[PDB]
Subunit: 80 residues, 4 copies
């Protein structure tokens, strides 16, 4: 069946304090080479064939539960 | 300058209650085609070159901060 | 009309890798005073009275949708 | 030691599609009495005494990692 990878991330149009804090933490740990840090959610969904088309199913789930399209962008990839 | 993509996910032998809870809700919402849900993290770190080797640096950041390697696996890809 | 507060948290005997990962990061960020981290969900549902008993209704919503009772505990409090 | 309860929620000033979807799901399941649904994150942090004051520690952690104060509100309660 299918392995669907979903990436959910804060829209770039929003201040990201958490990413800033992680970047600073890395510097404090002496990994001063870091210039920017971005952290998002990564999901792996195993999906079995059904009457619904795969693309319709995934977006429906991201629009309703896996994401808040008001403040986050989401994208996906499918593998077998 | 490099852009490091890091994928953090629970080890195969580790149960993922967060995903298991999401799977349950999805099922109640009629998405019974979802067989399994694994929730992890995706990150993009921009880094400058230094005296440190690329492989040595990414592994340290991952083991020391990005992932709790006792329960999480990590894999990375680098682009210019 | 009632306001139902629901607290969903992993059962004591269930490991919480999400929290364990957050705990690890917190430690690296110098917050070693954190001994344990358990991550769950909090919800507030506004409901109208009906023929259903209050206790019967809240338990069904919790068991059927709000929480995956195989791994999660739930407790609720109600206000007017 | 201390048991700190942290509640992280989307600011009321933001559209909440996920809450809307859960509300609709409840109606579809015949729990039509539901009028509104709000879902937030609930965390339980066990904290041991240190040189830092408890209130300073908690807010620092919420401002840096446990929350994104741009889109979410957070509050906490402490018990022994």
């Amino acid at each position: 069946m299918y392995k669907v990878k979903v990436y959910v991330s804060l829209k770039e149009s929003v201040l990201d304090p958490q990413g800033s804090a992680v970047q600073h933490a890395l510097h404090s740990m002496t990994y001063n080479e870091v210039q920017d840090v971005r952290i998002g959610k990564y999901m792996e969904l195993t999906i079995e064939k059904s009457d619904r088309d795969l693309d319709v199913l995934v977006k429906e789930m991201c629009e309703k539960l896996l994401a808040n399209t008001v403040i986050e962008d989401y994208r996906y990839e499918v593998e077998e």
